[PDB]
Amino acid sequence: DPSGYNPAKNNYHPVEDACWKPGQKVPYLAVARTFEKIEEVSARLRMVETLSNLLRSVVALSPPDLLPVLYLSLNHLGPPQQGLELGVGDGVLLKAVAQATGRQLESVRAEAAEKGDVGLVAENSRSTQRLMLPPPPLTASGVFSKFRDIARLTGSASTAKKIDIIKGLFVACRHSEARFIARSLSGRLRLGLAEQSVLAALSQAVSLTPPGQEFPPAMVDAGKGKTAEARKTWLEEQGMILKQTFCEVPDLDRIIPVLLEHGLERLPEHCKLSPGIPLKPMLAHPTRGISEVLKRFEEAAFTCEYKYDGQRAQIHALEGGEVKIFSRNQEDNTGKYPDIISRIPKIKLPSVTSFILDTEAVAWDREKKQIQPFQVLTTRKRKEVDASEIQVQVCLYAFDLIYLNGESLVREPLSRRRQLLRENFVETEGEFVFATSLDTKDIEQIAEFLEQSVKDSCEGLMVKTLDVDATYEIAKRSHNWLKLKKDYLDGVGDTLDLVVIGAYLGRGKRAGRYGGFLLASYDEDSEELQAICKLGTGFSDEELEEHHQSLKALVLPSPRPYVRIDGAVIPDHWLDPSAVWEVKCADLSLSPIYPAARGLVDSDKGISLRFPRFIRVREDKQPEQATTSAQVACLYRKQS
Amino acid sequence: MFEARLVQGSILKKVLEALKDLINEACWDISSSGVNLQSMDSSHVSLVQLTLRSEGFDTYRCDRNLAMGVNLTSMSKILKCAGNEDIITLRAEDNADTLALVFEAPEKVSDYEMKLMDLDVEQLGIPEQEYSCVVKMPSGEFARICRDLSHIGDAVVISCAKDGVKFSASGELGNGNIKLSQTSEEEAVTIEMNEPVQLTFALRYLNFFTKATPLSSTVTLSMSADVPLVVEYKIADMGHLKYYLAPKI
Amino acid sequence: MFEARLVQGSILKKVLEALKDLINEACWDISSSGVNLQSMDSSHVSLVQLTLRSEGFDTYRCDRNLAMGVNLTSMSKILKCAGNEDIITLRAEDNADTLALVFEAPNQEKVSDYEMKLMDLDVEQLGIPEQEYSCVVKMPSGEFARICRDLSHIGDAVVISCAKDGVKFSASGELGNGNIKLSQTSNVEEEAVTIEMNEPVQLTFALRYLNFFTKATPLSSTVTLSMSADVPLVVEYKIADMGHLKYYLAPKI
Amino acid sequence: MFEARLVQGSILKKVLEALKDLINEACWDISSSGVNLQSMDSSHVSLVQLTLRSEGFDTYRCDRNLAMGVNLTSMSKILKCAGNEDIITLRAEDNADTLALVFEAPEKVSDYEMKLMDLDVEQLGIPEQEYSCVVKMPSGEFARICRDLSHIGDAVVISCAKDGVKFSASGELGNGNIKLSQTEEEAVTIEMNEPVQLTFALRYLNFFTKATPLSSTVTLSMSADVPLVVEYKIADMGHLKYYLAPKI
DNA sequence: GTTCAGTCCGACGACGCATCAGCACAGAAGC
DNA sequence: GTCGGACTGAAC
DNA sequence: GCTTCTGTGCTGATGCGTC
Ligand SMILES: *OP(=O)(O)OC[C@H]1O[C@@H](n2cnc3c(N)ncnc32)[C@H](O)[C@@H]1O
């Protein structure tokens, strides 16, 4: 009986402490119990221990059931490059719950709002619609198979077929599996553990109880007789091995069978980087300015480059003559850029058969020979590969090289990689360039390069080591490079003061409290508040409670006549406009959703803040003395 | 090799349209008794029975009892091809993973092969039991009742008394009810009553059932405590459809 | 304690379906003389007037004058569950939050009863005494419907020019413009066009409301329009031995 | 100038109904022989031709050979205004961008004026061919079989022999066929020179069939390597043909 | 050895293509 | 995209 | 004529993928 299953016991045992027969399909109840235990614990190590405990039993008892258990734990449906999506939002699943409970929608809507979690509303109420066959127990293989079925059934009236499958899952629930299934569907599984931690749990399990042993296996603890420190040293070295082995091939479907069949030490001998298999991109830490750059890099050579304000593109060229592109997140971008597919033979040297490149693509002004803002880039059509009628011209901007001709280059110092990059490629201005790069260690030189960057439409500077700690491997550190954004390197960016007129009730950490706020600018020539943005970030938890209690008494049953809102979502309560908040922003964009400054720059397209960050309440001002539409228009004109 | 022929292929069209929106996959059992289906719904809330009696066919011949799985979507898109006047042949080769049909118009012949599928059979043997109410009514009026009730509420309370049946429901508008009385043939209302009974049902399922109305102008509803509701359509000398709906509370 | 019994319930169907889209809600005055309503539309451009004369009910029982607030979309769904040949009863308790609707089959077999929750409304009414309008037309309903359904494609507005010999409707738009002429006619009463008119008018209106106004067309095979300078057009359907319905639409520019 | 009258204006309604969905923009070429149009579709796979004989008009004056550029979708939007019973008058100026339609029912007059446009027209000369298989068959039968086969598979194989034509569809759902055998307006006739098999994509034939209410009979013309010809015989007025390039 | 330092995990945001739904009407077919 | 928050190691 | 339906978009409404 899995309802008594306790992996959090001391002295955990792989088969003795299990709750089903050998060879059997794993009861989904056990996975839900484990998620229940994981929610009970705040200690990350203890959570990874408990997950490794379950994983160890799974590979001991029912080897094929492994992959579903991982993808369940990953809240994912397969390889990210396969493009699978569940495609079911809050509204559809909410209706599914109302029908499974037999309730009307509005009570359960307000209930899920107040607890800010679909989980706890998924149990409780019951349809009383007594089935003629009580359902079989849920199995983790069956549940994952239903989630890929849900993803697959598109077309007209598809919502009916979704509602029917999800129904069967809900009515089949046994103890408390409903909460975890509902959170699992809604993306917000809130389990408090992700990719790096699950791979840790995998390494720990597959180390202690490796695969391929005949049941019952005679060995259970590879750590037996080792000191707890030297145990941990063995665990962690297998950690780095596996994590890098994951980052070179970010897909369990490739890794897991070969792992089960050959053992984790021989695993790399079968797995190598190649185009046609994606890789994780490179990461960077935020830094405020030059001192921290000089301190972090105090004994390493480095260079300075622009951060062009585009999007990343991962370029695969195969000797077979097709090319593939992936986004920053391994999503399969081929179909977005069939023109770039055509540009490949004029970008490479012909002496190169295959490559993997990391590059930024940015929209370009072909006649003005200059960059345009990112709100032009996001206008591209998505799926179909009709290169014929290109409305948005695009230029490529190289910054790093990953693979060439057969040699993988990831183990290599950046200096050599940039050397080979320049030496084995050709440029074409406004079609393909290398990123503007400047090699230095000194202050006012960087200040001059920054001033050129901001006036040449770039988010800041990129700072990277040339050789020391200048290999690509994400496992040592993911965030090796630095970004020097204008936002605080200016000392102060575009900071504004705006009027709060409404709140959004929060969920998860934000549950019970407000999670976001609605802001307006004071339009004096109408004397009205016009909506400008929401806020959802940059404030701590104690000051969160301070804002919540301060706001709670000022809620109103109606929107005031001195408030203009349109397209912006209705606040979860209406709030009297008496408070003004100081905030920074990254950029200003023409909004189709925000009435502020309508007709001051264009009659119909409004404006809004990209990336608003809370600072502090500006409690000394009255609301009418906050930022007015005139300064908003001046600021946006001063952006250009 | 199994072969069956009917002049009234319109029956087959009406039948599959009566099945369509309820289930997507089913395995059909064929015997010397004829063609028979059991299938629970993918929600496990309601079940269909099919009977086609072999003697109802103009031509029928069987070597073996067959259980073939069929995707109801594609095969109904195929059955759309038949005109209302067409003579249908169904043929199955015993080990085929495809099913052969011919449509014959009263110099033109339509020929089809549809791929089969392999299915993990769920079937429930319904016990024969008596029911505290049996009602014989016109299909068309039942259709109006159910379609009407669809707007007003989501669940129905069905009440029976010797004086006449009563259907009631409610929603975010108020309450709706119908009291329907007996007559004094194809237009008639008649009852086989045993005791005054009240049960609850989910109208979305009855609206799915109603699609069979063009099969027979009159129908049996059979209702008893603590058991599924039976709706049965007797297709004329050909067989029947039965639908079992589990109750609420 | 009101009762109305009506034999021809399809009348109520056809009148109610003309408002369900125009206005989501309404208020209904009941009095000894009959049933009355005046409402503004949702965008507050046009006005609807409704009169059902008590004489036309098969049975009557106005024990009080009442003003029910009613969601027309809900009542529309409800009567979309009413039979055409059915004989309709409305019953209202004075003290209730409900209107009872009960229906009896011609075969006496099928009895329907539904009850609808009432509510209050913030009634705005405007006084519109009769005026001796400068133009009056009677003409075939299906004709005008077809004309509006045509010309709304061409351009968003129509200009109507009347002279004693006949009327011309003009619409102008991006592909071009179109002018339809109608003459007065005689010796076809029901299919004829009649004009009583005092001076040649030329006025402009937005067809996005005209396509709404046409939705009554099955009520009366003839329609009247009336024009006057600097005032709303009136459009009226005569409810057969029962009442009338009128639209008032204010002039553009 | 140009000045025409047609009593059976429903013909021209059905004509413009046929074209609007396939080709959006076109050129009207006018002559003493009547009205003629050739045009190539937006995918450039299929060509249409309309022939209207001037003698079929109830009244007809052509002073010059015009070439008028017209948005067919907007033209159809105008033509929806007439009832099928309406008598139609067409009136053209020489320099004008603008064409007058006068509609009259059997006591009402519609005056409509359409602005023209300046267009790149692609021309294909079509010399005579004799087609190896010529099928004359009742139109609705073809239309319904097309709408059927659209589900079985996006492509068709057509077959002819002197004893009958067979139309086969093929896809993951299954494969299917219709046989037809040679048998007044209910009859099917074939003239066959050489037995044929051809492969085609259905999307276009689905479009062609919208002309069906123009004619009780349709004629199929087939020969090796050439586009399929489908023809709608307008009674005494002229003809309407579609050419479709066979696949690969 | 603890005041720092970096990991890692989930809070929230602004756009926009896709992408499907929900009346609502012409249309044809059946009566 | 971005900022805070809980946790194990960092190294002066 | 009316029926119920079917195929018809037209315009709206969020899910999901970027930063
Ligand atoms: O702000 P962020 O954390 O998302 O930044 C990382 C992204 O910055 C883009 N970018 C632009 N230019 C470069 C260069 N020169 N080097 C590295 N990254 C660069 C990328 O899109 C990256 O994901």
Coordinates of N, CA, C and O (backbone and C1' of nucleotides) and ligand atoms in Angstrom, one line a residue, chain A residues 281-286 305-313 328 359-360 397-400 435-436 459 462 464 481 483 485 611, chain F residues 1-2, chain G residues 18-19, ligand 1:
Chain A
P281 N 22.9 27.1 -23.9 CA 23.7 28.3 -24.1 C 24.5 28.7 -22.8 O 24.4 28.1 -21.8
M282 N 25.4 29.7 -23.0 CA 26.2 30.3 -21.9 C 25.5 31.3 -21.1 O 24.7 32.1 -21.7
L283 N 25.8 31.4 -19.8 CA 25.1 32.4 -18.9 C 26.1 33.4 -18.4 O 27.3 33.3 -18.5
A284 N 25.6 34.5 -17.8 CA 26.3 35.6 -17.2 C 25.7 36.1 -15.9 O 24.5 36.1 -15.8
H285 N 26.6 36.6 -15.0 CA 26.1 37.3 -13.8 C 25.9 38.7 -14.1 O 26.6 39.4 -14.9
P286 N 24.9 39.4 -13.4 CA 24.8 40.8 -13.3 C 25.9 41.4 -12.5 O 26.3 40.9 -11.5
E305 N 32.9 43.7 -25.0 CA 32.1 43.7 -26.2 C 30.7 44.4 -26.0 O 30.3 44.6 -24.9
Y306 N 30.0 44.7 -27.0 CA 28.6 45.2 -26.9 C 27.6 44.0 -26.5 O 27.8 42.9 -26.9
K307 N 26.6 44.4 -25.7 CA 25.3 43.6 -25.7 C 24.3 44.1 -26.6 O 23.5 45.0 -26.3
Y308 N 24.3 43.6 -27.9 CA 23.3 44.0 -28.8 C 21.9 43.5 -28.3 O 21.8 42.4 -27.7
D309 N 20.9 44.3 -28.4 CA 19.6 44.1 -27.8 C 18.6 43.3 -28.6 O 17.4 43.6 -28.7
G310 N 19.1 42.2 -29.2 CA 18.3 41.2 -30.0 C 17.9 40.0 -29.2 O 17.4 40.1 -28.1
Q311 N 17.9 38.9 -29.9 CA 17.8 37.6 -29.4 C 18.9 36.7 -29.8 O 19.5 36.8 -30.9
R312 N 19.3 35.7 -28.9 CA 20.3 34.7 -29.3 C 19.7 33.8 -30.4 O 18.5 33.6 -30.5
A313 N 20.7 33.2 -31.1 CA 20.4 32.2 -32.1 C 21.5 31.2 -32.1 O 22.7 31.5 -32.1
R328 N 17.5 30.3 -27.6 CA 18.2 30.3 -26.3 C 17.7 29.1 -25.4 O 18.5 28.6 -24.5
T359 N 25.3 33.1 -31.6 CA 25.2 34.4 -32.4 C 24.0 35.1 -31.9 O 23.0 34.5 -31.4
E360 N 24.0 36.5 -32.0 CA 22.8 37.3 -31.9 C 22.2 37.6 -33.2 O 23.0 38.1 -34.1
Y397 N 25.2 38.7 -35.6 CA 26.3 39.3 -34.8 C 27.0 38.2 -34.0 O 26.5 37.8 -33.0
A398 N 28.2 37.8 -34.5 CA 28.9 36.7 -33.8 C 29.5 37.1 -32.5 O 30.1 38.2 -32.4
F399 N 29.6 36.2 -31.5 CA 30.3 36.4 -30.3 C 31.0 35.2 -29.7 O 32.0 35.3 -28.9
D400 N 30.7 34.0 -30.1 CA 31.4 32.8 -29.8 C 31.2 31.6 -30.7 O 30.2 31.4 -31.4
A435 N 30.5 40.8 -33.4 CA 30.2 41.8 -32.4 C 31.4 42.7 -32.2 O 32.6 42.3 -32.2
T436 N 31.2 44.0 -32.0 CA 32.2 45.0 -31.7 C 32.9 44.6 -30.4 O 32.3 44.5 -29.4
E459 N 22.5 47.2 -25.0 CA 22.0 47.2 -23.6 C 23.2 47.5 -22.6 O 22.9 47.7 -21.4
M462 N 29.5 43.4 -22.5 CA 29.9 42.0 -22.2 C 31.3 42.0 -21.8 O 32.2 42.4 -22.5
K464 N 34.3 39.2 -20.6 CA 34.6 37.8 -20.7 C 36.1 37.6 -20.5 O 36.9 38.3 -21.1
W481 N 30.6 34.7 -17.6 CA 30.8 36.1 -18.1 C 30.0 37.1 -17.3 O 29.2 36.7 -16.4
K483 N 27.6 40.9 -17.5 CA 26.9 42.0 -18.1 C 27.0 43.3 -17.3 O 26.9 43.3 -16.1
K485 N 25.1 46.4 -17.5 CA 23.9 47.1 -18.0 C 23.9 48.6 -17.7 O 24.3 49.0 -16.5
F611 N 10.3 46.0 -18.2 CA 11.1 45.6 -17.0 C 11.0 46.6 -15.8 O 12.1 47.1 -15.4
Chain F
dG1 P 18.5 38.2 -22.3 O5' 17.1 38.7 -21.6 C5' 17.0 38.8 -20.2 C4' 15.8 39.6 -19.7 C3' 15.9 39.9 -18.3 O3' 16.7 41.0 -18.2 C1' 13.6 39.3 -18.9
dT2 P 17.7 41.1 -17.0 O5' 17.3 42.5 -16.2 C5' 15.9 42.8 -15.9 C4' 15.4 42.3 -14.6 C3' 16.4 42.1 -13.5 O3' 16.6 43.2 -12.7 C1' 14.5 40.6 -13.5
Chain G
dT18 P 11.5 30.6 -27.6 O5' 11.6 31.7 -26.5 C5' 12.8 32.5 -26.4 C4' 12.5 33.8 -27.1 C3' 13.1 35.1 -26.3 O3' 14.4 35.3 -26.8 C1' 10.8 35.4 -26.7
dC19 C1' 13.3 39.5 -24.3 C3' 15.7 39.8 -24.3 C4' 15.3 39.1 -25.5 C5' 16.1 37.9 -25.9 O5' 15.7 36.8 -25.1 P 15.7 35.3 -25.7
Ligands
LIG1 O1 20.4 39.9 -20.1 P1 20.7 38.5 -20.3 O2 21.0 37.8 -19.0 O3 19.5 37.8 -20.9 O4 22.0 38.4 -21.3 C1 22.5 37.3 -22.0 C2 22.1 37.5 -23.5 O5 22.7 38.6 -24.1 C3 22.7 38.4 -25.5 N1 23.9 38.9 -26.0 C4 24.1 40.0 -26.8 N2 25.4 40.1 -27.2 C5 26.1 39.2 -26.6 C6 27.4 38.9 -26.6 N3 28.3 39.7 -27.3 N4 27.9 37.8 -25.9 C7 27.0 37.0 -25.2 N5 25.7 37.3 -25.2 C8 25.2 38.4 -25.9 C9 22.4 36.9 -25.7 O6 21.2 36.8 -26.3 C10 22.5 36.3 -24.3 O7 21.6 35.2 -24.1

